[PDB]
Structure formats: C-alpha cells, structure tokens
DNA sequence: GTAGATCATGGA
DNA sequence: CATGATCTAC
C-alpha cells in the first residue's frame, strides 16, 4: 500500500471512529424507549454531509463532527498526515471518503 | 505409379487458403469414394491415395477426362438450384442450412454475374410453428466451379497445364486484380493442383451472418456476410470439424461480432484435459460499401487464436446465456441475436476482460431499452461468468457491496409506496440506470456511487470488506466501476 | 568465418501487405525475407535486384507489434482517364505500430565481389561515400525507418522472438517477390518461436535466390 | 554527396477531427491505431499531408502536373507524360504510370516511375484517444432522416515524421518551397467547416546530414492524456548524449526551445551545440542559408 | 495573393446552457469533454455558429440561399441548385448534394472550431418544475448550467469567396452575432464578442488559436495566455498583422514593460468598433475593393 | 490475328 | 464494382 492509501484508510478508521462516538453519545442521550433508531443517524449523518456546499463549510462540519466523536486513537496516532491529507485535499474527495466510511460502518454489537 | 497430381499440408509455398482447399478436397474425395467404392465405377478410372496430411492422385487416359468427371461430381445441382456439394453430407443437413450455405457462397465466392447464370427465383413455403414462411432464395443454373476442368486442362492437347494458371478473386477470395487496364498481366497465378485445391476452398470453410445492432433487425435484414477459414493442423481433424458443424442449427449462424463466428466454428469442439488444445482461425468481413453495391467487398480480417480457456469459457457462455431469438413475421424469419454473447465472445477473442465494452455497447448504444431489456434475461449467465471467473474476486465483493445498497435504495421506496402505488422493478431499475449515465467523470461518479452506497443502508459486505472495497473504490478507474454497477444491476435478484 | 552482420531496425509504422492481397491490405507479422534485401539494398544503392543473390538473413523480433487498420483511397490504373471517378477506391490497410527487430545479415554464399554484408558495413563505417537515392524506409514509401544502426548479438539483451523456417508453420513469407503477378514470387513458410537466443538457430536463416 | 532534410514537427493544439474512418450509423470514426504503450491515438495519414502539401504548391504558383479542381472537386492531370524536370509535383512526389504496375524493371526509353524525393510519415495524436463525440442535428422542425449524426473529434497535438532526399531533386531549388510550405500548411484534409484545426508547426527537430538514418522521427510525447505540455522524449535526448546524432545537425525550434533551456545542466548538456531559435522562423532562415551553400543554390 | 482572417474571440461572463447533448433520462445533459489539463470543459459546436452567422445573413437583408422560417421553424431553399455566385450562405458556408452542370459541393470560406468554455466545469445544475399540484411524469426536470466565457477560433480564406466583398458582411456577423443556439427563455447568453484576437496575413500559418487563458480555475479573468505573449515577443507574429480589441487591451496596457515589448506596435483598440473599422479599412485596402 | 478499350452484367 | 465477352484498331 502506498503512503497515499495508509493515509486515506487510517481517514476513514478515524472517521468512523467519529461516528461511534458521535452515535454512543446519542445513545446514552436517548436511552428512553425500546432503542434509540441507528438507520435514523445515518441518514441524519448523510444528509448533513450532503448539505455542504463549499470547502469551508465542509471542512468546519467534518472538524466539529470529528471532535464530538472523542478520543479518536486513529487520530491519536496520526496527527500530522490526517492533519495535512484533511487541510490539503479538496473537499469533494474527503466528503466521499467521509460517506464511504459510513457505508463500512459496523455498529457495535 | 506416379501420381499425376500431388498435394500436402508440408509443403512450404502453401497458404491458408490452399491448405482449407486440400482440406475440402479430402472431404470430397472422402465422400466420393463412399459413393463410388469401385475405380471403374469413377470416370478415368480416377484413383485416389489419401493420409492425414497428403493427398495424391492418380487416373488413366485424358487428364481432362478424369478431372472433369472429379469436377462435376464434386460440385452440383439439386432439381432446386441450390449448390450441392458432395464434400457435405447433404442427407443429413436440411433445406434451410443448405439454403444457407448456398447464399453465403454466392455472395462470398460467386459474388460475379460472369461466374453464374441465374435461374428463376424459387419460392419455397416451409411451416415452422404453424406458420408458413416463404424463403425465396435465386436459383443457379451453372457456375465456375463445375467447369473449371476446362480451365485447368490444354484446349488442344486435353492434358494438365505445365504452367501457372493465372486465377480470379473467385477462386482466392480477395485476389483482385487491383489495375483493371492491366487485366492480361497483373493476376494472380498458381500451379494446376493448387488452383484444384482452391477450387474447393468452399467446401471447408463456414458462412455466419453478421448483425448490425445499431439499426433495427425487423427495420432492415443482414447482408454483411462473415467467412470462416479454419487453420488446417490435419486432414482428418478438420474434416471431423466441419461434419461435426453440420449439427448446428441456421440461427446459431447469425452473429454480432466476428469474434462470435470464430468461437462457433469451433464451439463443438470436445476439449481434452491430458491434450494441449490450440486453434486458430480467420474471419472475412465482407459487406456492400452503399446501398446500390452490385456485389460484396472485403473489408476486414481478424486472425482468431483459441486456447483451452477460451473455448471452454465461451462453451459454458453459449450453455448458460439466452439463445438467439426465432421473431418471425410474414414470410419473413427475423432471427434475432443475442448481443451480450456477442459482445463476450469478441471480449474473450481479444484477450481482454470479458465485461471491456458493456457500458457504451449495451446503454449508450440502446434505442427504447431493446439492449437493456435482455440483462434481466441473461441475469444466469452473468452470475455464472462471475461466479467462474478466472480472477478478479475484489469485484465480485463489490457486485455484492453494490446489490446490498440498491436493496436498500428500493426497499426504502417500495416501503413507501403502499399495493398498488408500488412501481416495479422495471422504472426504479431505468431510473437508477439513468442516474449512472448522468455521471462524466471520476469526481461525480465516485460521489454519486459513494451516495448510493449510503442511502442504501447497512451494508455488511462492505463491512467485511473495508480495506479492499475502499481501496477498490478510491483506485479504479470509475468507467470499469460503472461497467461492473451495470452488470451488478442485471445479476440483481429481488 | 567472419561473424555475421548485426542490424538494428525501429520503423513506427510499416506495411508488408500480403502477396494474395490484393483487394484488402492485410499485412505480414513480420518482415518477409524479399522486403529485408530489397530495403538493404537501398541502403547500399544498388539497383539491381540478382546482384547480391545468395545472401541470408534471419531476423528477430524485439517485441510484438499491434496490428491496426487505417482507410485510404488509393488509386488504381482502372480507367484511360486520370479524372474519372472509377480510378479511386477506398479500402483498408493493415499497419504495424512500434516495430522493433534485429537483421543478421551473412554473405558466405555470394559469387560476386564484394558482398552485401560488406557493402553495409561500408556504408556504416563511411555514410558520406554512400551514392543512393531517396529516404530509407521498411514497407511503403512513405513509412521511413526511425532508427537503422550497427549492433550487437545482446543490444537490449532480453529475449527474442526468432523466425523459425517451419514445414508446420502459419505464415507464408516470400523470399523472393514478382511484382507484376505471382509467377516468379517465392514462398517460404516460418513460425515465431519465443527464444532469448542473442544468435540465429540454423533454421533461421533464409537465402535470398532468384526464382529459377 | 547525398544530402537529406529529416524532420519532427509537432502540431498545436486544438480539437480535431481530420482524416476519419468509414461511417458506422451516424458516427463518422476517426480513424486510430495502437501506438506507445499500446495505447490507442488517432493517426492522420500519410496521403493527407502530402496532399496537403501538393495544394500549398498548387495554390503559389509553382506549375504542377497534377492540378486540383477546386470546383469540380476532382484531380486533373496536364500532361499524362510526367515530366519531373517541369513540374514540381512530379519531382517531389514522383508518379507511377501504367506501364510501371505490368514490368518489373524502372525503364520501359521514357522512365516508367519515379520514387518520391519526399516522404512523411502518419501523423499521430500525441496524447492517447478517449472517446469524444458532438451531437448533428440539423437545424428544423421537419425531422427526417440524414440528421441526429455524431462526429469523432480529438482535442490533442498532431506530431508527423518526414524526410527529404534533397540530392534526389531533379531541381535542387525546389526543396526551398517544400520547407516553406511545411512551415505554412494550408489545412490537412478534414472538416474544416466543424473543426477547424491549422497544421502549422509549433515544435520542430529538423536534421540536414549527409547520412541515411536519423534517429529523431517522434522525439515528441507527454502522454499522461489530456495535457498539452508534450516535452521532449527520454530516449531522444539519451541517443543525443550518447554520441550519435551529431549535435551540430539538429535544429531545434518552437515553443519546446523554452522548455529545453527552462532544463538545468542544459548549458553544459551537448543538445546545447544544437541550432536552437525559438522564432521558427529564424531557425528556418538559417537551415535554408546552410542548405543552399550546401546544395549549391547560391 | 492569398489573404487568410484568422481570428481568436472570447465571450462575455454568463450563465449558458447552449449545449444539450443527448439528455440521460431526466436531466438535460450540456456537451462537454476533456481540455487543457485534463478537466471537463463544456463546448458549444461550431454548426451553432454557423448557424448564428446564416441568421445574421438573413436579417440583415443578404440574399441567402436558405431562408430560415421563424414562425414555422423549418428551412427553406430558394433555389434547389446551390449557386454560390448568387447566394451569400452557399458562398461563405459551401454545400454538398448528396442524393441518388453545376457543381454538387463547395469547400466554403469560412472555417469555424468549436467554442470552448474558458473555466472548467463544475457540476452545476438546474431543477425546472411545472407549477401546480397537479404533477405527473413531466413535472419536475433538471438542466445543467455554466457559468463562464466561451472562446471560438475561425478562419476565413478571403480569396476563396466567389466575391471578396462577402468577407465585411461576415465580420459585422461575428461582431453582431445573434442568438447561438441554446435556451434563451431561462439562461440568455449573449455570444457577442468581448475579446479579439486577429490575424490578417499572406502567410497560411496561424499562432493565435484559443490565445486566452483564465487566472483563477473559478473566475471571471479572462487573460492572455503566455505562449501567446512569449511567440509575440520572439517574433513568430508579425505585430503589423496583429489585430487585438475588447476588455483584454486593459490588462495588456497594464503589462509591465508593455512600451518596451513588440506587442506595443500591434494595432490595439479598447473600442471594438475601430478595430473593426481599421480591420476593414486595411481589407478592403488590400483586396482593391 | 491479337491486345487495348468498351460495354454488359448482375435483385428481393 | 470486378471481370470477361466483345468491339475495334493496328
């Protein structure tokens, strides 16, 4: 694997790592009922992600959406190469990584 | 003694075209002493020693005699007009085939008014389903190859030529005389025997009907005619061949590619696992240049090499995909063609992957869905092809990835959509079809298939697969992605 | 004996179109024998065509060149007027793309003084004594030759694919050409045998000889 | 002493769509091959750029045997006797005559033939093809047939090879137009009316040696398609360091002169000795003084 | 002798959509393809201004072979046999026959290429729907839109027009050029020209195809390319025969060193009108109309 | 008497 | 259009 790979798949473990945070705390908010929806998240994730229309708006959501993930030890391991593949890329091809990482995205079970 | 004519696959100044006349003068001789088991029975007391790679002659009195004897029992005609050729085994073949193969002679070889005398235009109504449909085929009364012994013999001494004879494009298909003005000088010239063997050229080599998918088959009928013209290895093995092809049926005859034509003359071909299996062949294309052409031009050649792989894939292909299609109207037996096979056929002859060429062939390419619609019906072929392919898993996973999403994409509609109010899978399916070819470049299509893949869930395939999918993704150019999402739609089981 | 002369052929586009075709220009895979001595024969000026009689040639192909169709409305001697319509025709020419190749060249069956091989290895050792006329080429006028040089048994010192004169093999090269009909043109059949071989089996070699 | 004029140019770029194929529906193919790599570019042959040439000499005087009716639209010859010491046509690009096709010798006595002193290898695309078509129909509401076509286009860099035997001139003046009129192309025969695409060079390698092989024929390609940069091939310079192609042969120019000096070492590389201009046609000026005090024009 | 009107024009900033291809299922697809660099540009064909040149032909009273019927939308031959000594379209524009004394085909004056968009394509698109409640299959579409400048290159081979005095008429078209093809009910683009390049020599060779460049892939800047510039500054092109007009003079005059540089000497007009008149002043001049 | 040019000759 | 029978001129 080239080091562009590395880099793109340890994007997509940090962003799904973002997600089980995000989706944990909304768990633990909406524990009341049979069980909080999970299909219902990701199309909330989706449609969020397919709102943005420029780079600046992106990169501002796919910064917050990644810091409300948590620790993040994708990141924790990797702060210069996903720092500079997040601030150097356009933001159409980070959005798709984005949106494939949600796709191979297993729930805990 | 010493045969007056002698003729083997080992000499060095041969051709192709020579050798696949030896070959059908074999056949012809093969028959021909079927017929006549005695020597005194054959005029001249014609004679014949033949082995697998060697043909000789010998007979008393005239040359001409004998040969013109040869001649006319070789080459004939039925109370019908149609060309009957003993090399065949005409009992067994049927009046269609033979109308077939009388057509394709006649406008391959004698593509010339100067080379036959027509007769009447002989209707015939053969029932086939209840219906009764008028072939009407033109009728011959005399051709080049029945006399030709004229030609290959003296006018005055009636013995064989000790010099070149010089032959027409009739005889060696495409040996045209380029300058007209030198009609006496630049012709090709070959060696009595020789031009014996081309004489029967046509016995061996096979005639398939070429399809043009861009206009409609009911709007105009074929006239663009393919010739096959087997690499003899040996005597017997071919003649083997071309009886064994005499199973086949007259639409199997009718193709899209030249590819096809190839494969199907060898199709029959049993395959040998302790036997290094190895053929090759070359297909004619010969098609009117306008509307108005009196005759056929030859346009194209395509050598076709086959190996074992290759046959065996395109057997399971002809086993597994929809057969050629029988539409018949008034008087009319409109054949149509499969234009997958085709298409995987020519993919399989020029060693490329067997799904190349599907997207601009099979969508952009498509009038009112007429391609499209014959997906759903070779759905098992395609789930074999990829089942059994010889390589290339990681997109198999991703059929799998693609056909768990639109799942998804379906059954989020068709929930929504109560009895009645749901559409089926037909508008959902062009829709989705559509979408894919709004796509123009790597950046909208990735985002568009990326999109998808969301929108339609869950997706444990994915799951399973993250590293390799996304890697898939991210690094495959998005025409073979779109090409392997159409055929992921049509292996797609509700 | 003295070691046999080694060429260097690269012509981006050639055409060895078939002797039997005639109505459509199919090519040859590789050079035939009578193309190789007519174009070194060029190379050496030399007009007449029985001077350098006797002389072998083997040669090898460096790699496998992609066959490709082009149209052309090429002209024919058909109709007394140059004007007329019928003296045009359009049909397809058969090319091959990025030849590469080696040419041995041995002259040890010529009887006329001096020989071909010579005659090359003087005119690669002194190219402005060289009197010919017009511009190198492989195939038709127009396809000229990129690059012709002196080399040696290993100059991409990979693997070759050779020119076997095989009883059993596919194509039918000649050797030598009549260019009025086909009386006089002289066939040899050969094969492309895969084989690393810097040299040339003894099977390789062709002598170029009249058609008598 | 022979003397020859080899020769790389390369085109400008621009969209495409010159020689074409036999039609196929409403498509009009233009007309590939295999090249490099094995990739599929878009050729432009050979006749074309000859003819192209023949009617730049046609169009400035220059008496030619083998005249182009432009209303007609059809080939007329003035003298059915070729005469290579009257027309440039036929001393350029020679002639075939009737007796040449049923003879095997040259003489049959008036010569049978002549050889070309000129010839040109198939334009190519630098830059490999991708399927580009443009839409046809016909302005109207009266829809019927002959409308809705697809035309084939390519919008890439056309480089061609040619070669010149100056010694096999009957007039050894006459080379001097065929330059001028490699330089000033009129248009290479294709749909002028859609694509209009100008073959004047923008890059040329010319060689005027006394030897009868030159190994510059397509020192031109980028590849890396759809791009425009089209630097100079690898292998080029490698045979120039090398030793053969003598440096003081080469004439280089066009806009890949910038490129060639933009190349650190250049100063000191040996394609630096070479004749380099960037005005094309002041290198032109200076390859014609050198050919005409060379050939004896003076 | 032989005098040749080459020329590079550049269209105003503006939203187009002039260039419908095929449309894939709902979506109204505009023509587009590869260009400089390898990213998607959207083209509008040169039949579209041919077309628009005919029009202007027509309007402006020129005796046109085939007349153009605005209420009925169809075409219409005066004259079955085309005669270019007549009729300015089949003079300018040539014909061909084709179908089962005077010539059936014409080479035609003017050759056009296809109009280029300057910026890449984005994507952007369009969403049209019917109003009202009462929505069916035909409801709701999409059209794709671009919003950039479109440059064109032409040639013209004044002595090929069987009258050399056809050649002004086609230049006040170019300059006055009606409506390109396209939607002008949602998306009016004018094609007007706003920035000229031309060349008006002897010499068969031209330099000055698709001369403009953009500063920004997204932007409305619309300067002159280098190669252009650096073919000027060696020589190649004859300053004398230089022809530029429009919003490029501005940035050219604010080139540093531009008094100094041989594009100085070129004739440059801010105003496209006296560039024009001087172009043809110097035509007819030369023409001896 | 023989070679070059010309003309006939071909559908469902 | 390709090719041979025939017309025709030397």
Request: net charge neutral; proline share 4%; glycine share 4%.
């Amino acid at each position: 694997n080239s080091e562009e790979d590395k880099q793109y798949l340890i994007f997509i473990k940090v962003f799904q790592q973002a997600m089980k945070g995000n989706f944990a705390k909304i768990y633990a908010k909406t524990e009341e009922g049979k069980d909080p929806p999970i299909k219902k998240k990701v199309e909330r994730l989706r449609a969020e992600l397919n709102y943005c229309y420029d780079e600046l708006s992106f990169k501002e959501y796919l910064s917050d959406f990644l810091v409300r993930g948590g620790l993040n030890k994708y990141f924790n391991e990797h702060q210069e190469e996903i720092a500079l593949l997040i601030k150097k890329s356009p933001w159409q091809e980070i959005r798709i990584w984005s949106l494939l990482a949600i796709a191979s995205y297993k729930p805990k079970d | 003694t010493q045969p007056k004519i002698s003729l083997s696959l080992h000499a060095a100044d041969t051709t192709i075209m020579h050798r696949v006349g030896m070959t059908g003068l074999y056949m012809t001789l093969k028959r021909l002493e079927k017929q006549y088991p005695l020597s005194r029975q054959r005029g001249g007391h014609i004679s014949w020693f033949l082995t697998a790679d060697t043909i000789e002659l010998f007979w008393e009195g005239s040359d001409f005699i004998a040969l013109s004897w040869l001649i006319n029992e070789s080459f004939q005609l039925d109370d019908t007009g149609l060309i009957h050729l003993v090399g065949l085994d005409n009992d067994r073949i049927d009046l269609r085939q033979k109308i077939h193969i009388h057509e394709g002679i006649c406008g391959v070889f004698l593509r010339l008014n100067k080379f036959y005398q027509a007769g009447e235009i002989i209707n015939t109504e053969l029932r086939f389903e209840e219906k009764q449909v008028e072939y009407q085929y033109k009728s011959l009364t005399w051709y080049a190859h029945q006399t030709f012994a004229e030609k290959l013999c003296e006018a005055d001494t009636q013995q064989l030529r000790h010099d070149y004879i010089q032959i027409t494009s009739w005889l060696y298909l495409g040996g045209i005389v380029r300058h007209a003005r030198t009609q006496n000088t630049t012709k090709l010239e070959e060696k009595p025997e020789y031009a014996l063997a081309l004489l029967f050229v046509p016995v061996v080599c096979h005639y398939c009907l070429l399809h043009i998918p861009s206009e409609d088959l009911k709007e105009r009928k074929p006239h663009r005619y393919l010739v096959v013209i087997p690499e003899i290895k040996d005597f017997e093995d071919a003649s083997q061949r071309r009886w064994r092809l005499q199973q086949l049926e007259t639409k199997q005859f009718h193709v899209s590619s030249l590819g096809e034509a190839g494969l199907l003359y060898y199709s029959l071909d049993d395959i040998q696992p302790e036997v290094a299996y190895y053929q090759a062949c070359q297909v004619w294309l010969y098609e009117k240049t306008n509307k108005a052409s009196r005759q056929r031009t030859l346009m194209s050649i395509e050598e076709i090499k086959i190996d074992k792989n290759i046959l065996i894939t395109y057997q399971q292909v002809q086993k597994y995909f929809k057969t050629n299609y029988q539409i018949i109207k008034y008087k009319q037996i409109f054949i149509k063609v499969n234009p997958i096979r085709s298409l995987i056929a020519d993919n399989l002859v020029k060693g490329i992957h067997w799904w190349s060429n599907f997207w601009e062939k099979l969508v952009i390419e498509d009038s009112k869905e007429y391609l499209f619609n014959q997906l759903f019906s070779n759905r098992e072929g395609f789930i074999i092809m990829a089942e059994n392919s010889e390589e290339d898993k990681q997109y198999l996973i991703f059929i799998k990835v693609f056909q768990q999403a639109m799942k998804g994409n379906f059954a989020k509609i068709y929930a929504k959509t109560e009895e009645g109010k749901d559409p089926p899978i037909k508008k959902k399916v062009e829709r989705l079809r559509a979408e894919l070819n709004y796509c123009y470049d790597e950046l909208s299509f990735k985002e568009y298939l990326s999109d998808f893949l969301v929108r339609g869930g869950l997706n444990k395939y994915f799951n399973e697969h993250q590293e390799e999918i996304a890697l898939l993704i991210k690094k495959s150019p998005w025409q073979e992605i779109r090409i392997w999402s159409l055929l992921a739609i049509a292996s797609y089981k509700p | 004996m003295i070691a046999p002369l080694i060429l260097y052929l690269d012509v981006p586009f050639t055409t060895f179109r078939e002797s039997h075709a005639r109505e459509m220009g199919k090519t040859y895979p590789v050079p035939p024998p009578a193309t190789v001595y007519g174009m070194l024969l060029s190379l050496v000026g030399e007009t007449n065509v029985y001077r350098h009689c006797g002389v072998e040639l083997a040669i090898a192909m460096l790699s496998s060149p992609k066959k490709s169709r082009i149209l052309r409305q090429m002209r024919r001697f058909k109709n007394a007027d140059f004007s007329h319509p019928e003296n045009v025709i359009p049909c397809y020419q058969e090319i091959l793309s990025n030849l590469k190749c080696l040419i041995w060249v041995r002259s040890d069956e010529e009887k006329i003084q001096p020989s071909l091989r010579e005659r090359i290895q003087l005119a690669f050792d002194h190219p402005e004594l060289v009197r010919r006329f017009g511009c190198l080429f492989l195939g038709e006028s127009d396809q000229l030759i990129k690059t012709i040089k002196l080399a040696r048994e290993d100059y991409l010192e990979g693997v070759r694919q050779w020119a076997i004169r095989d009883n059993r093999g596919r194509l039918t090269l000649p050797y030598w050409v009549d260019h009025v009909g086909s009386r006089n043109t002289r066939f040899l059949r050969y094969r492309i045998e895969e084989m690393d071989r810097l040299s040339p089996p003894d099977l390789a070699w062709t002598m170029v000889q009249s058609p008598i | 002493p022979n003397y020859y004029l080899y020769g790389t140019v390369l085109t400008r770029y621009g969209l495409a769509s010159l020689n074409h194929d036999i039609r196929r529906g409403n498509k009009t193919i233009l007309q590939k091959g295999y090249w490099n790599n094995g990739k599929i570019h878009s050729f432009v042959g050979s006749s074309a750029i000859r003819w192209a040439l023949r009617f730049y000499l046609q169009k400035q005087g220059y008496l030619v045997n083998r005249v182009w009716d432009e209303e007609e639209h059809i080939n007329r010859l003035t003298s059915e006797d070729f005469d290579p010491e009257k027309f440039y046509d036929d001393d350029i690009f020679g002639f075939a005559l009737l007796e040449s096709a049923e003879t095997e010798e040259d003489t049959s006595s008036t010569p049978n033939q002549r050889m070309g002193a000129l010839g040109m290898n198939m334009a190519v695309s630098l830059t490999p093809y991708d399927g580009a078509v443009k839409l046809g129909a016909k302005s109207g509401r009266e829809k019927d047939s002959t409308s809705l076509h697809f035309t084939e286009y390519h919008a890439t860099r056309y480089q061609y090879y040619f070669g010149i035997d100056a010694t096999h001139l009957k007039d050894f003046s006459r080379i001097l137009p065929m330059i001028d009129g490699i330089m000033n192309l009129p248009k290479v025969g294709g749909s002028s009316n859609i694509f209009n695409y100008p073959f004047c060079p923008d890059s040329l390698v010319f060689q005027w040696t006394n030897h009868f092989a030159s190994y510059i024929s397509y020192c031109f390609e980028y590849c890396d398609p759809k791009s425009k940069e089209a630097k100079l091939s690898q292998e080029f310079i490698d045979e120039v360091e090398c030793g053969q192609i003598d440096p003081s042969k080469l004439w280089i120019g066009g806009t890949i002169v910038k490129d060639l000096q933009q190349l650190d070492n250049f100063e000191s590389s040996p394609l630096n000795k070479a004749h380099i201009y960037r005005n094309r046609n002041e290198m032109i000026e200076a390859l014609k003084t050198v050919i005409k005090r060379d050939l004896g024009l003076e």
